[PDB]
Structure formats: C-alpha cells, structure tokens
Amino acid sequence: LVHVASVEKGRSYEDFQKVYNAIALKLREDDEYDNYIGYGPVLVRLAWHISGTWDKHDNTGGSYGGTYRFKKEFNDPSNAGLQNGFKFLEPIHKEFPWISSGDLFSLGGVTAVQEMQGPKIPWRCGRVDTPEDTTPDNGRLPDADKDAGYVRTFFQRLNMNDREVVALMGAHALGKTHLKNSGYEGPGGAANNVFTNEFYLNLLNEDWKLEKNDANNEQWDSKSGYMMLPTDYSLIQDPKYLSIVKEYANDQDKFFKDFSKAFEKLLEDGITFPKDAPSPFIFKTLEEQGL
Ligand code: HEM
Ligand SMILES: Nc1cccc(N)n1
C-alpha cells in the first residue's frame, strides 16, 4: 500500500506558517484548559496517536489518511480524551479548510512541542484524506500495564529502535494521566507544559513506590506527587533502556535532537515523498516572530 505525499494545491511554507501561528496563538489564548496546563500536551498526544496506528508490514494506519476524524478511530478507547485536542483544532481547520486532516493533526503536535520551548521539529506537508473504510481498527496503540519486553516489541511495528523509543517516551514529562481517560492519574513531573528532559531526571532521581490508584491499576508514585506508568518504569528496569535514560538525563541538547528526529519520523511513517517534493519546513515560534 502506497501513500504519495501531495502538496495542498499551490500552498507553500508561508501558508503553513500561518496555520502554525493560528494554532500557537490559540494555545496561548485558551490557557485555562486542564487546570491551566493548556492544550500543548494533548495536542502532542493526538499527533502521536494518529501516527501510532501505523503497521510497517502493510502500511495500514498512519497519519497520512487523517482517519482519526472517523468515529471508529475517534472512539478508540486508547484515544479517550483526545476529543479535546480535536475540538481545539476545529476552529483552525475552519479557517484553513484547505489543509488536510493528517497535516493538521501532525502540525498540531509539532506546533505544541515548539511553543512549549521544545526542539524544532521539521515538518512536511502532503498527507491526503482517505475514505472511512481505510480507518484502522482499535487496538493498535500500546497498553500501559506492560514491561520493557512488550514496549520493545510493540515499537518494532513502528520501525523504532531502543534509542528512538526512549527518546519518544520523554514526551511523558508533558501533561498528566487522567483517571477518567486511561485509568491512571497524575503528572510525570513539575514542568508539565514546558518541554524538557525532566522525564529522565525524575525516573532516576525520584524514589518510586508501586501503588494502586483509584481505578485499581498499579502505577509508580513518588512523594513529590509524580507518577510513572509501568511502561515508563520499564525504561529503568531494562539495562539497555536504562543506559539511554541516563544519557538523556545528562544531555538536554542530545535529547532534543534525538526526540526531534524520532518525532518527525513517527509523524511521517507510511508516507512516500516524491524526489521533487518540497524540503521539510522548520516553522518559527511566535516568540521568534515577535508575535
Ligand atoms: C509505551 C507507549 C505509551 C504508553 C503505553 C502511553 C500511555 C499513556 C497514557 C496511559 C497516558 C494518559 C492519558 C490520559 O489519561 O489522558 C498518556 C498520556 C500522554 N502521552 Fe503517552 N504513552 C506511550 C507513548 C507515548 C509517546 C511515544 C508519546 C509522544 C512522543 C506520548 C505522549 C503523551 C502525552 C503528551 C501525554 C499527556 C496527554 C495529556 O496530558 O492530555 N506517549 N500516555
Ligand atoms: N504526564 C504523563 C503522561 C503519561 C505518563 C506519565 N508518566 N506522565
């Protein structure tokens, strides 16, 4: 199955920077969301979940088709809570009806990371909306009550290696888990709407205790009020993952560079870019634009 990137008719860098700006401005405006965490975190999760349905074996799923807009995927139990991100992007899509859903969902994630002071994430346009019959079935996203072995195997389907997996998980420093959405409760750190390498520092420096939350699920909690999912904790349980966790905890720049590459790769999995397609766009933040 092949998905060839097709640039929205006549659009260029400037058009997409305008969409980015609209998203960034709304992020700044609607600051009260989720007890003032803002929509940054949920937008990053949305971009990851619409991309995380991909299967390298047959190229089903993936961000290309923007299938999250269809009820089967929209209602995936694994996507509980993402409706908030979708609603946030609705007015954006209304103003820029020309951008495809896949491009909008993925751009939302890139915009969020950058506006939260994270690394620059090159982004490519061209995803094209596909029929409702192309929507992937539920169950392709990962479980959180598993171990390192599960995590490693799961991500091989997304063509991600150990380093890429550990780097991507760093996004768990963002936002929080919500009991009503996933059966887990609590943030991973203190700075939950600013993109940093705090995820790794906390895994290594906090004293975690295996407890049961009000949904009767086990999770690791610290006195500081932070939490880690069993899958997050597996990163310091597995010796190979542990080495990488230590690396990122001690090199903020390295983490930023590796996360950027892995996140762009995640958002582009399944897409074939023509040799003459535009080069990846690197959008300026509102701050860099003096906006
Ligand atoms: C091992 C794979 C993964 C597991 C099992 C997992 C599990 C979870 C769970 C259970 C939540 C809480 C949802 C809620 O209650 O609202 C969550 C939130 C989150 N996830 Fe992951 N996740 C994984 C991978 C990733 C990756 C690769 C990224 C992005 C690079 C990511 C980004 C996020 C973000 C930003 C949030 C917070 C969302 C919010 O605050 O609304 N996760 N994840
Ligand atoms: N904020 C957050 C989201 C998912 C997992 C963790 N540990 N923390």
Swiss-Prot record:
Q: What is its EC number?
A: 1.11.1.5
Gene this protein is translated from: CCP1
Something else known: Present with 6730 molecules/cell in log phase SD medium.
**Which family does this protein fall into?**
Belongs to the peroxidase family. Cytochrome c peroxidase subfamily.
Higher taxonomy: Eukaryota, Fungi, Dikarya, Ascomycota, Saccharomycotina
UniProt PTM: CCP1 precursor is processed by the rhomboid protease PCP1, which cleaves the N-terminal hydrophobic transit peptide. The m-AAA protease (composed of YTA12/RCA1 and YTA10/AFG3) is required for CCP1 maturation: m-AAA protease promotes membrane dislocation of the CCP1 transmembrane segment within the transit peptide to ensure the correct positioning of CCP1 within the membrane bilayer, allowing intramembrane cleavage by PCP1.
Name the job this protein performs: Destroys radicals which are normally produced within the cells and which are toxic to biological systems.
The catalytic residues are 49 (proton acceptor), 188 (tryptophan radical intermediate)
Q: What is this protein called?
A: Cytochrome c peroxidase, mitochondrial
- Of the intact sequence, the residues represented are 71 to 361 of 361
Q: What class of enzyme is it?
A: oxidoreductase
Cofactor(s) this protein cannot do without: heme b
Q: Tell me what organism the protein belongs to.
A: Saccharomyces cerevisiae (strain ATCC 204508 / S288c) (Baker's yeast)
